[PDB]
Design a protein around this ligand. Structure first.
Ligand code: ATP
Ligand code: ATP
Ligand code: ATP
Ligand code: ADP
Ligand code: MG
Ligand code: MG
Ligand code: MG
Ligand code: MG
Lengths: 503, 189, 465, 42, 26, 469, 138
């Protein structure tokens, strides 16, 4: 602390007034970093307020100055401006008043729909739940996609990474998961309701506006909170936005309800955090990232948990998004998030342009919850599907130069081709779990071997309609039983053969 | 608010010197704080044990301020220089106590308007040489100026006169003049 | 107040003030300079010293030279008086046609429009380029990026977009030459005065030119894109117009920022770039958008260094664009022009509910054949064409016919190619690729599909052989 | 999408010799001819 | 990456050795 | 003495003392703090200032806050009272079962046992895993490393080793959860309770758990491995027991040291790491050893970043282990579980004079067939299976039978797959692979070798396939 | 220094002569960091640049005011193309038509000093040195 005014008043023995323990003055300001002299009673990661009305967070506490990141444009901050302590660390509004609202990283509404009447505020940096308060992940979290709910299942309380290149369908997976919860939120079952939270980090405001337009048209906005820290916002806002959205989802998790968080995308939050660390003169590491960039994502995603029945039983499900560069998952940030999350959904550009949409690489996509994240009917049909897809994987290569094949092998090749075309699905149309089970069950029991793969989608709509208004007793029978009995299997096969004769 | 120094002195040591100059000129102790600082610097040079003691980073700052205070009571330093050295030992800045004093000497030399003159001659001379050299050097003076003359001897310049001012310099010496003439001989044709 | 120069290192000048510091992004004017030298405040260093970035050359600057504070950021002329004129980064006219007499001025630093002022409507902008109109169609009002290396063709592609879209356009256009050839600026300027888009006689001009080229210092090259934005922002907001903004090229804005950041005393980021690469780009790119007041259709050429799409500057630009057009050197070396990569260009309007079911299915069908061709090309390279008899050879034959048919002669490339430029309606484009996908043209040679616009010219070329 | 055999070691499907580790299409050819022989045997 | 190119270069080198051996035999 | 906080930058806190300075590795406690934040002295900066790393979150710290020197390093409770309990990095009970009442405390920093105290006993530890028992057999009292990337099966393998060894071991066991998922720690805690290894009622608990997970700061994740090691060292030394030390994951000890090393004023090393990587790993690993007083059988899961075994953290760990089992993604993608690479996993007791001549010759014979299989795959790609001659036909056929037979269903993975778990004796493993090498089962299909424990189940599965088809 | 007094002279990067032919009697100097001309003072390139090479002047035609890159590997003839273009202008410089006259500046950066001397010998034998300035920084 040796500046010319402070040095000179130390020579005179003036003992100056305006004591700098709850206040301070800016020494240097630039690139969103303000070095402030004073603020002696300040706390680490504490909010401050500048004389221009802007807010800031004190990250570096040093004997001479305080390193403060600026929540906005630093053109308003000037050298010698008065910085005041807020007195508390960063907190955001929480509650159900934020459902249907678009907010920034600090909780201020940006959709122009008026003030938010929230009653409670939680600090964004709470500690994750421990070993005791959480229970094993057991409830299915329905994405609505056949390739996800069967092969890479997601349970309530699980971090599942959606990783891929640019324009591979990562946002498509996340938005369709939010849209799929319309069925459960309309129903009377309070246990199966899911309140989604979408966090947009570093995107365009027109991209976020297109997201809100899609969610409002599908009426998914009533249970969705959109936290938006776009590219025009400051790097501290984009860094703070996943923790703000996590705190909003932690309100539902701690109150017995089930919430879903999408961080779209965490690769941009690392870029924002790298910019703050470099401009705070902290020494960089791999790809100029700070050392604590792993702890950045680990302390965020660990707060996604399935609480025990003594803590209300609520869950917090996280779907982080990571963008790779030409499929390089050996980079610093994709490697960290893969090692943190409970599973991955790899999306490949080669599969995307081969017609496979969603472009999920089944050989690279894992899920550490396994069959416990699936319902009983889905577990019965996805296990048989995983065996048949494994058998198809052994025999799918024969189309390269093979010409004569065994009759059983040809049946395996034909059924697996039907299954690969079964896993394809259009965008913005998530299907219910009963429809996914029924279509997959027909695919793995040979009910589609006589159908050309080009008409699989037409069969998927029309046959499901036929067993909906006419054979709804069978659907009630499966729902009450919870699985597929041999008698129900024979009944469904007879309806399939009757429908194929009429087809 | 700080009073502008007569000349700009750079570095952290110059920042302390300008702070001490501004504090001493806001009060009326410019001549007093210069006198004890010169006497302190002369005391440190005459007793190298004191300089090694202050610059020792192992010793605690309480022992340094006690040693500074004990040797500054004999200087009859009253308020500014005592607080200046207390500020130097409060920080880890008394390792360059010679630096701030030399910077403060540079400020006060320009306060009186003195301009350093350096005249180099092959052989020493006086009487006729020194009389005209003083008048010739005085011709460069704007009103309100003083001459600090330093005479040097160097046989490497053969003869002539190498006279320098605070920022200006000429090389009217025999050694350089024959050097460029021989360079003109080699580059003639 | 009045400041004095403390330090000059390249394009970065440190100015110390006595009474009051100018704010960040304020414009400072150096006094003893015969042309105007403008310094833009970047940061406060302490001790009443600010660090600035010069908009021109810093040679001849001495320490202690007086610097005047204008009290405002860089304000440039905006309005109808800028149409048909060429201005530099600081708004001075460089067309030698006198001053830009106007009452309207605007700072080149402005906040991006808020989330409320966003338009969600998407309509297809028909170009006349078959590869663009089929696989990555452009949105009428939206951000379009032209990724490519050096020589793959981005200036030619953006000049063809000016020739097709901007000539028949009910509105105004803005061209921002950012760190490109001054020869290209002279060529485009005389192209406008010859095509009538710039009128030197009356006030019927429709395009405003802003040029800071590759001979300019890094301060000018990192701010002249903001000057082109400010002209286009005035037309969108204060007049409600539909504006075209062509930027060639936006990588030079980021590259010039990295050159200044070396002298700003920052710890370098990945691949030597500035730490604020994404934030500076995001602040600039979010101002280029269509709001409820007016629409801006922006086409931005994007240079990739060393033909690397994983470089931080092109990679962060990908998320700012509705439609991307990635130009490949391998395709250009095959003689296929425009060298658009079919499996790397996206549109964000390639949707059955936006462009139609038949347009979407043909585009996805084309990409499926070309992706199957890329998978088979390793067998073709080492072993040869002997693979799967009828099936894979039909895939190769159709894909090579599609690759030839994606090529198209440009009207702006007609000077150095000889082939007449073709403007192809999008109905003829989807009809032409549907004929190739259906196998109706398997008997034609693949040379007949090359460098001809309509599919009727393909069969006419085949009959000519 | 299933990680076809011979597409690459760690790339979804593969594992074995240099061709199978490199993946691409020759690893697919190696897996195709090998699985065809052992399916004929069974 | 560097490992991917090294693996692919090793495989193509083995492919050339086999085909050169096949070329001499054939 | 008493000190005051000077700087707080990330997980690194600089504190300044007026009296004598605390030594390096001493434990400091922040006074005005509710969850008992603890700082560990890392270096003396000079001018009576030491630089520390925080064992908990640093939010809310104020410059000038009083810090108390405990006069000793971090001391944790040790003894039988830690059995069936969960401890954090600083020894506080995080299982919500009240305080750990005990009389013995041990510092988590200690010197490694000397060269005179080293034991050269090497006897094979039978695990029931066929690829582990045959190719890279574990030794009792030796160090076992489970190398692998993300998702290859290190956690499932270390859960299977706990099920097969620690349930009927005899003697205490210690699990150290270092920088992993809290869900996995909750899953293991309830699996131990259901298995009876943890008793919530009686004193018959066998395993002591220490957990510092991904949500912990880098200071806690870089010291929690030393906390679990201190519990294992007390059981080895002060009780003479045979100790099982399961660590997952030990890479997080290295990674958490690299996160704070930049803020400690260190130039980064190659790739990017602390310059003290080999020394910090060496001091930690050499405490985990079999003394002449007692034996510690250590099984450590080792994360391989981006499946690059030449990364400096897995590469330095190889020299510290008697047996290393490398889990490969290529093996896992084929469906083979466990995904142990047969040509990358080594053991020190793989000797003719330790495990017998028949065990060694079959293991070397298996590795020779699998290596020739990799060499032949390039000829298969170019020449095709048609032109291979009957010798290479039998090499490829027996290699695929061997490669399928290395897979095995795990009891802890039964909920994942549905296959019942199977435990295989070492004698049945040697006999089963000898039959495949001899060619006794050349008429069997290769699908009969997939996910079956003994070779008698291979014959039964082949008969079932033939009878059904 | 700039001017027609530099024609036939080999100089270093500072303009000092290095060929030992005496001083340079130039009366004008020009800054090395002058900015390029803008949009208006330029005009389209419409006058041919005759390199004398059949493959260049037919397939890659160079104009006056153009920047044409000569790119390749080492020892592929890059200097041979450039020197032949300098030599070719003798037929235009000897003629009385001054609009087709072309002066030459050869800048050798990082080369060997023996290579530059052999280039100057080639220009002197072919009488191409009368209109050529060689700036040498070896
Ligand atoms: N299952 C699908 N079927 C059809 N089109 C799809 C599907 N999934 C995604 N798409 C389309 O592919 C394009 C890219 O997908 P999306 O934008 O979701 O990917 P992303 O990885 O989020 O891209 P970005 O890198 O721009 O964020 C969009 O035009 C989207 O409509
Ligand atoms: N559509 C086209 N038709 C024919 N030739 C073309 C076309 N586009 C580009 N080319 C060729 O490529 C050259 C490069 O043109 P262009 O200036 O557009 O490239 P660029 O990507 O802007 O490169 P630079 O980085 O030099 O600006 C042209 O001069 C021409 O030879
Ligand atoms: N057209 C030609 N006919 C005959 N010889 C030629 C021709 N062009 C070049 N050469 C010879 O080829 C050699 C290499 O050419 P040159 O030295 O001009 O290439 P360069 O690219 O300048 O190489 P360097 O890397 O040394 O600069 C020389 O010996 C030159 O005489
Ligand atoms: N022995 C096994 N049998 C079947 N699947 C396994 C086995 N081991 C691992 N897996 C697969 O790996 C996933 C869990 O991997 P895990 O052990 O958590 O990896 P890591 O040890 O790298 O965390 C499961 O979803 C499962 O599908
Ligand atoms: Mg997206
Ligand atoms: Mg260009
Ligand atoms: Mg694990
Ligand atoms: Mg050469």
């Amino acid at each position: 602390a040796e500046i010319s005014a402070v040095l000179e008043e130390k020579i005179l023995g003036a003992a100056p007034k305006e004591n700098l323990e709850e206040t301070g003055r800016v020494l240097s300001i630039g690139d969103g970093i303000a070095r402030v002299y004073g603020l002696k009673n300040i706390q680490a990661e504490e909010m401050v307020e500048f004389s221009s009305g802007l807010k800031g967070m004190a990250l570096n506490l040093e004997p001479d100055n305080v390193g403060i990141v600026v929540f906005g444009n630093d053109k308003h901050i000037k050298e010698g401006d008065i910085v005041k302590r807020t007195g508390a660390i960063v907190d955001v509004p929480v509650g159900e008043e934020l459902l249907g609202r678009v907010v920034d990283a600090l909780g201020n509404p940006i959709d122009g729909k008026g003030p938010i009447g929230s009653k409670t505020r939680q600090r964004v940096g709470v500690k994750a739940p421990g070993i005791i308060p959480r229970v094993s992940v057991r409830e299915p979290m329905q994405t609505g996609m056949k390739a996800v709910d069967s092969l890479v299942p997601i349970g309530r309380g699980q971090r599942e990474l959606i990783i891929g290149d640019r324009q591979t369908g990562k946002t498509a997976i996340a938005i369709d998961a939010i849209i799929n919860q319309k069925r459960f939120n309309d129903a009377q079952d309070e246990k199966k309701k899911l309140y989604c939270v979408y966090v947009a980090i570093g995107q365009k405001r027109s991209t976020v506006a297109q997201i809100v337009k899609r969610l409002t048209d599908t009426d998914a906005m009533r249970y969705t909170i959109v936290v938006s820290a776009t590219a025009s916002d400051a790097a501290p806002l984009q860094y703070l936005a996943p923790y703000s959205g996590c705190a909003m989802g932690e309100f539902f998790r701690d109150n017995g309800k089930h919430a879903l968080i999408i961080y779209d995308d965490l690769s941009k939050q690392a870029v924002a955090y790298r910019q703050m660390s470099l401009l705070l003169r902290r020494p960089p590491g791999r790809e100029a990232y700070p050392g604590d960039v792993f702890y950045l994502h680990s302390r965020l995603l660990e707060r996604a948990a399935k609480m025990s029945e003594s803590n209300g039983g609520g869950s917090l499900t996280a779907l982080p998004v990571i963008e790779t560069q030409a499929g390089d998952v050996s980079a610093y940030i994709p490697t960290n998030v893969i090692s943190i999350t409970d599973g991955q959904i790899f999306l490949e550009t080669e599969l995307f342009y081969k017609g496979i949409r969603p472009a999920i690489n089944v050989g690279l996509s894992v899920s550490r919850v396994g069959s416990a994240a699936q319902t009983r009917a889905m577990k019965q049909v996805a296990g048989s599907m995983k065996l048949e897809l494994a058998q198809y994987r052994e025999v799918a290569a024969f189309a390269q130069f093979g010409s004569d094949l065994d009759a059983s092998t040809q049946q395996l090749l034909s059924r697996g081709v039907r299954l690969t075309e079964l896993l394809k699905q259009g965008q913005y149309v998530p299907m219910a779990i009963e429809d996914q089970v029924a279509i997959i069950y027909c695919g793995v029991r040979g009910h589609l071997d006589k159908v050309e793969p080009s008409k699989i989608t037409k069969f998927e709509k029309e046959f499901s309609q036929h067993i909906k208004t006419s054979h709804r007793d069978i659907l009630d029978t499966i729902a009450k039983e919870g699985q597929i009995s041999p008698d129900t299997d024979a009944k469904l096969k007879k309806v399939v053969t009757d429908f194929l004769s009429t087809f | 608010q700080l009073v502008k120094a007569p000349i700009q002195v750079f570095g952290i040591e110059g920042r302390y010197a300008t702070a001490l100059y501004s504090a001493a000129v806001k009060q009326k102790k410019l001549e007093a704080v210069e006198k004890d600082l010169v006497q302190l610097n002369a005391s440190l040079k005459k007793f190298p044990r004191l300089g090694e003691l202050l610059k020792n980073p192992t010793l605690s700052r309480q022992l340094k301020k006690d040693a500074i205070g004990s040797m500054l009571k004999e200087q009859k330093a009253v308020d500014l220089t005592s607080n200046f050295l207390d500020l130097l030992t409060e920080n880890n800045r008394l390792k360059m106590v010679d630096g701030v004093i030399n910077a403060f000497k540079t400020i006060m030399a320009a306060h009186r308007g003195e301009v350093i003159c350096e005249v180099t001659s092959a052989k020493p001379l006086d009487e006729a040489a020194r009389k005209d050299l003083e008048v010739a050097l005085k011709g460069f003076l704007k009103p309100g100026q003083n001459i600090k003359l330093t005479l040097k001897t160097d046989p490497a310049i053969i003869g002539g006169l190498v006279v320098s001012i605070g920022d200006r310099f000429v090389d009217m010496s025999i050694g350089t003049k024959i050097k460029r003439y021989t360079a003109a001989l080699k580059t003639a044709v | 107040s009045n400041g004095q120069i403390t330090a000059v290192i390249g394009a970065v000048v440190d100015v110390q003030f006595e009474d009051q510091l100018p704010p960040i992004l304020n414009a400072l004017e150096v006094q003893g300079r015969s042309p105007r030298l403008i310094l833009e405040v970047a940061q406060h260093l302490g001790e009443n010293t600010v660090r600035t970035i010069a908009m021109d050359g810093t040679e001849g600057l001495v320490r202690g030279q007086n610097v005047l504070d204008t009290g405002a950021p860089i304000k440039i002329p905006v309005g109808p008086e800028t149409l048909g004129r060429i201005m530099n980064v600081i708004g001075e006219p460089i067309d030698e046609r006198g001053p830009i007499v106007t009452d309207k001025f605007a700072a080149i630093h402005a906040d991006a429009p808020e989330f409320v002022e966003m338009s969600v409507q998407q309509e297809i902008l028909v170009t006349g380029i078959k590869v663009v109109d089929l696989l990555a169609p452009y949105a009428k009002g939206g951000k379009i990026g032209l990724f490519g290396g050096a020589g793959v063709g981005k200036t030619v592609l953006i000049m063809e977009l000016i020739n097709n879209v901007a000539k028949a356009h009910g509105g105004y256009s803005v061209f921002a030459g950012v760190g490109e050839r001054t020869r290209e600026g002279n060529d485009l300027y005389h192209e406008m005065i010859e095509s009538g888009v710039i009128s030197l006689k009356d006030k019927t001009s429709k395009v405003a030119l802003v040029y800071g080229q590759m001979n300019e210092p890094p301060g000018a090259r990192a701010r002249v894109a903001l000057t082109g934005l400010t002209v286009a922002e005035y037309f969108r907001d204060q007049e409600g117009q539909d504006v075209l903004l062509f930027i060639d090229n936006i990588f030079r804005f980021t590259q010039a920022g990295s050159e200044v950041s070396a002298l700003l005393g920052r710890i370098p980021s990945a691949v030597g770039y500035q730490p604020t690469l994404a934030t500076d780009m995001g602040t600039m790119q979010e101002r280029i958008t269509t709001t409820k007041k007016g629409s801006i259709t922006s086409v931005q050429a994007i240079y990739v260094p060393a033909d690397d799409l994983t470089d931080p500057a092109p990679a962060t630009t990908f998320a700012h664009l509705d439609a991307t057009t990635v130009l490949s050197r391998a395709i250009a070396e095959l003689g296929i022009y425009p060298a658009v990569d079919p499996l790397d260009s996206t549109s964000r309007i390639l949707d059955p509910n936006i462009i139609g079911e038949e347009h979407y299915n043909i585009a996805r069908g084309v990409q499926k054949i070309l992706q199957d061709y890329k998978s088979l090309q390793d067998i073709i390279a080492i072993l040869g064409m002997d693979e799967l008899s009828e099936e894979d050879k039909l895939i190769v034959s159709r894909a090579r016919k599609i690759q030839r048919f994606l090529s198209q002669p440009f009207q702006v490339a007609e000077v150095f190619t000889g082939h007449a430029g073709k403007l192809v309606p999008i109905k003829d484009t989807i009809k032409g690729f549907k004929m190739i996908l259906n196998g109706e043209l398997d008997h034609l040679p693949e040379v007949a599909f090359y460098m001809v616009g309509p599919i009727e010219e393909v069969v006419a070329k085949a009959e000519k052989i | 999408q299933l990680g076809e055999l011979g597409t690459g070691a760690g790339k979804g499907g593969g594992g074995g010799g240099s061709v199978r580790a490199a993946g691409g299409s020759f690893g697919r050819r190696e897996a195709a001819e090998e699985e065809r022989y052992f399916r004929q045997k069974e | 990456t560097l490992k991917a190119v090294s693996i692919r270069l090793k495989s193509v080198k083995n492919i050339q050795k086999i085909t050169q051996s096949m070329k001499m035999v054939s």
